Amino acid sequence: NQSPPRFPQLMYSLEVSEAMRIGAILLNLQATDREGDPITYAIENGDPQRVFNLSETTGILSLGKALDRESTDRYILIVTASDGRPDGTSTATVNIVVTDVNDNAPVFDPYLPRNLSVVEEEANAFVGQVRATDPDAGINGQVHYSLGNFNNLFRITSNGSIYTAVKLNREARDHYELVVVATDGAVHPRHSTLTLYIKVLDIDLE
Ligand SMILES: [Ca+2]
Ligand SMILES: [Ca+2]
Ligand SMILES: [K+]
């Protein structure tokens, strides 16, 4: 009497870049009915924000809306092809994985202190620590710290910790508006900057 239409594979897998263009063709999951019927394809579940379009007649699966892997990096679509009959409808499952692009700069924790203090006449003295984070993946969110001024006076480490490079002298200067630069280790790198306000104190004798 009846066989339902059969998808080639009963489970698909697929990478898509988050930068992929709207309208781009992602997968061809057309089935065939052995008694030549017309077939109707629909995404039953797995795509609540309607990111993907699955042609009702063709079978083609394209991208409908823009992706972002910082919001969603994975989808599990439940697709169906049906012929019309009471139970002439079959189910496959597409498994989609979104891959990274470096579309995000480091961002400094706004809650850590900016106003810092270090004693004078002391070198390799701990001034304080900053931190910045990047939501991108792998090297695209590895953050490298550097100083944008006073490089002869202060050094900064990979863990964000800042030190005096040399004995400072309050009488020479007591405030420093230091600048820190967080940069991601991506091939096409992005960065941001934070100004600190460092104050010099003195040992109390002379
Ligand atoms: Ca980044
Ligand atoms: Ca990204
Ligand atoms: K993104």
From Swiss-Prot:
- Residues in Cadherin domain copies: 8-108, 110-204
Tissue expression pattern:
Expressed in brain and sensory epithelium of the developing inner ear. Expressed in the retina, in the photoreceptor inner segments, the outer plexiform layer, the inner nuclei layer and the ganglion cell layer and, more diffusely in the inner plexiform layer (at protein level). Not detected in the retinal pigment epithelium (at protein level). Expressed in the spleen, dorsal root ganglion, dorsal aspect of neural tube, floor plate and ependymal cells adjacent to the neural canal.
Q: Which residues are glycosylated?
A: 53, 115, 159
Q: Where in the cell is it found?
A: Cell membrane
Q: How does it assemble?
A: Antiparallel heterodimer with CDH23. Found in a complex with TMIE and LHFPL5. Interacts with LHFPL5/TMHS; this interaction is required for efficient localization to hair bundles. Interacts with MYO7A. Interacts with USH1G; this interaction may recruit USH1G to the plasma membrane. Interacts with TOMT. Isoforms CD1 and CD3 interact with TMC1 (via N-terminus) and TMC2 (via N-terminus). Interacts with PIEZO1.
- Written domain comment of the UniProt record: Cadherin repeats 1 and 2 mediate calcium-dependent heterophilic interaction with CDH23.
Name the linked condition. Defects in Pcdh15 are the cause of the Ames waltzer (av) phenotype. It is characterized by deafness and a balance disorder, associated with the degeneration of inner ear neuroepithelia.
Q: Function, please?
A: Calcium-dependent cell-adhesion protein. Required for inner ear neuroepithelial cell elaboration and cochlear function. Probably involved in the maintenance of normal retinal function.
What's the protein called, per UniProt? Answer: Protocadherin-15
